[PDB]
Amino acid sequence: RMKQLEDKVEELLXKNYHLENEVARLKKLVXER
Amino acid sequence: RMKQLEDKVEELLXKNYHLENEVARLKKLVX
Amino acid sequence: RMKQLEDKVEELLXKNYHLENEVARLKKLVX
């Protein structure tokens, strides 16, 4: 159940690295150039 | 302690699904 | 292993608090 949890954390980090790669889509639709 | 850590991880999932539902307010500002 | 697991979850809390500081860069473009 511990290593189910370790590889839930490795779902989360790779959800976060989708969200970051939406955020950095919106910044690059809208910003610096 | 694992069953504290799982129940931090399943908080971090329910921060990520806050942050996505902020990002998807900003995407629907921009609309 | 438990205290490797605690210190992945505190990489994750401290990613979440990077994403919030991308989102609050996006808010300071958009609203």
Side-chain angles (χ1 to χ4, degrees), chain A residues 2 5 9 12-16 18-20 22-33, chain B residues 1-6 8-9 11-16 18-20 22-31, chain C residues 2 4-6 9 11-16 18-20 22-26 29-31:
Chain A
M2 196 180 292
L5 187 59
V9 175
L12 182 64
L13 269 171
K15 273 172 162 54
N16 290 317
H18 164 88
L19 184 55
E20 194 180 328
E22 295 305 308
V23 177
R25 199 182 71 89
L26 292 161
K27 284 172 87 202
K28 239 354 139 116
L29 179 66
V30 172
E32 305 291 31
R33 44 155 188 169
Chain B
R1 188 44 182 174
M2 197 190 69
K3 240 246 93 196
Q4 292 171 8
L5 263 11
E6 197 158 67
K8 286 174 176 198
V9 166
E11 298 182 1
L12 283 162
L13 282 158
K15 245 293 139 75
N16 164 271
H18 175 82
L19 254 179
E20 186 167 344
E22 292 318 302
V23 172
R25 197 183 77 90
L26 291 164
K27 178 171 87 153
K28 238 10 117 107
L29 259 48
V30 181
Chain C
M2 195 132 58
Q4 291 159 41
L5 203 45
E6 299 180 19
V9 180
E11 293 161 51
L12 205 322
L13 181 62
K15 181 55 85 189
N16 186 274
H18 176 58
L19 254 185
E20 288 266 348
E22 285 298 289
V23 167
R25 292 184 268 280
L26 176 56
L29 298 184
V30 180

